């Protein structure tokens, strides 16, 4: 039901990039046209790690090649060229999300990866060792101690399917389109400051029926992102 | 109804040099104030930089050694005795990037700041938690605030942005009523220390500041009680129980 | 005095570990033997600090003497790699060992040498509490000295304090008797390595602990650090210890 991160994602709100961000109350034109076309908008939680995917039972790391640079052997474009490639020898921390097997020529169980996902109820996250094939064809977020200084306080390197966590009581952006409410920036900012989930998140990525996505980082909202300003993700209420 | 931080604040308990450690003796001024018929409201000490909203602008505190130069617009408000410094306040200087950064950003402003809007952390409607709220700076005019956030003291409170907090906002609960030591109870240093270690609010706070009807205040930092004050040893202020 | 064991030797791993010292799904032979003999197994939280003990009425730090160096004056051997295990009296430079004492600005040492700050279970076994205690109440017992200046305070403790080894009893920790042949019959449960790792990841207490130490009825002890389970230990991956639910 959720989309796949294969190209860059526009911002929910028009934001000027000062080389800081100068956010505005103006929604993305594409998002307005989609909401008026009748697409359902599912707000999901944006995590802070390194973009990956499972492709034919293997983990593939995202790599954006800039103009004129050597395309890595194995790169497969998807959407400043965006694409994915297989892991290299030096990708110690990418392979560390696999479950271990010291009696193997690789030391790894190549068919099992640790993941953080929703438990049987829809109330809390849980670490689970899943078959890597369960994530085939899906984009994931690799997170842990050695990625971004572990701003979520995760206890091990794990993958999280994008769109897993669905945000509760997030501002219904359809109320700012043709408009009942008009302060989309402040309302969203207030949701990240005073909601029960906001403090656990780096931002919000919207998943629509078109396969489109629209994101907002804490930096657009003039907010701080860090392990200090972040509550552990494993303690997030769902 | 809360006091304004204009002069250096005295300690609740007579401290002893070794580092200043609190002992089991209350401040003579606090004894005299409690006997003279004064109310004592324990508030929550937070860790940041002292400021105040004078007129409609934020003012940062600056202390001056009497044998120095007074900056333009500096306004004295008190004077220390131990160090002999001059207490006061200033209008923010160009370089106070993170002081100005507590204002609400404004795409329709020549500087990108709604100079009449600040982000502050205050008590919610019910009074059982703290919320971030964008407010008109005029509502804080005349009051002293503690500016906190990422770039101040290394954000020991785990705040999500630079915000202001009116001094005295967080009224403590179950904090020792320091009239029982002026005597029904004897160990004020043990009970006060036990409160920061084992209360539900202590773990979130840098210390305590008593606000009295006389305008007097008396403070106790964790360092007076021989405790650690750091983000590791502090639970986020925004999830403090009230 | 108290029913918990005294850390005077090295502690073996609950599970047979491989080689980075990672645990496998096989219990220690000594543990299986001890279990089958009918020993009571008490799972207790392992906390990251430094090993000490209250001897006479003084804090003593543990020091392992390598087989190629001299024994310090006042060093007591208590156990046996190739190094001895023993305890010393605190040296004048151990500023942060003495810092778990209650301060006293009127004493020669600046400390109340008869009172130490310790973290223990409160009246009702539902939470941990900091508690000023007469040091003589710990005489003979090994404690875990923890605080800001020990391992960078992965527990987020508001002060250097002592904790009697075995104070925190674990709830819902796998009962390792179901993983051992009972009257020769098949064990009721086969995957200890899996069940344990999921305890540290998804239990209510696991995320607050460095590991687990089983305190058996016969004085033996067995351990598992988060690393044995391929898990991270650090302040960011650890919830404050004083918030651990009991
Ligand atoms: N729920 C989610 N939906 C989409 N992208 C996500 C999600 N959670 C984390 N992300 C990541 O956030 C990135 C977008 O932000 P950025 O890479 O900083 O421009 C994507 O490439 C993803 O790897
Ligand atoms: N609730 C409060 N009441 C009074 N002062 C406070 C409060 N919270 C923080 N402070 C600050 O605490 C400082 C006094 O303690 P110290 O920093 O040890 O001199 C003052 O500069 C105040 O700005
Ligand atoms: N409840 C406990 N029981 C036994 N040892 C403990 C406990 N908590 C912490 N420890 C420490 O764990 C250490 C085990 O060795 P190591 O895991 O190699 O550091 C001992 O030296 C103890 O000081
Ligand atoms: Mg980015
Ligand atoms: Mg100060
Ligand atoms: Mg060891
Ligand atoms: Na990221
Ligand atoms: Na001072
Ligand atoms: Na302060
Ligand atoms: Na200051």
Residue numbers in the entry:
A (entry chain C): 16 to 34, 47 to 106, 113 to 211, 217 to 276
B (entry chain A): 16 to 33, 47 to 210, 217 to 276
C (entry chain B): 14 to 32, 47 to 107, 111 to 276
Publication excerpt:
In the WT structure, either AMP or ADP was modeled in the active site. In the YspRLIG1K73M structure, ATP was bound in the active site. Both structures were virtually identical; thus, we use the YspRLIG1K73M structure to describe the interactions related to catalysis. We superimposed the active sites of ADP-bound YspRLIG1WT with ATP-bound YspRLIG1K73M. In the ADP-bound YspRLIG1WT structure, the O5-Pα bond is rotated to flip the α-phosphate group toward the Nζ of Lys73.
We identified C12orf29 (RLIG1) as an atypical ATP-grasp enzyme. Although the 5’ to 3’ RNA ligases contain the ATP-grasp fold, their catalytic mechanism is different from canonical members of this superfamily; they transfer an AMP moiety from ATP to the side-chain amino group of an active-site lysine to form a ligase-(lysyl-N)-AMP intermediate. To gain insight into the reaction mechanism of RLIG1, we solved crystal structures of WT (adenylated) and K73M Yasminevirus sp.
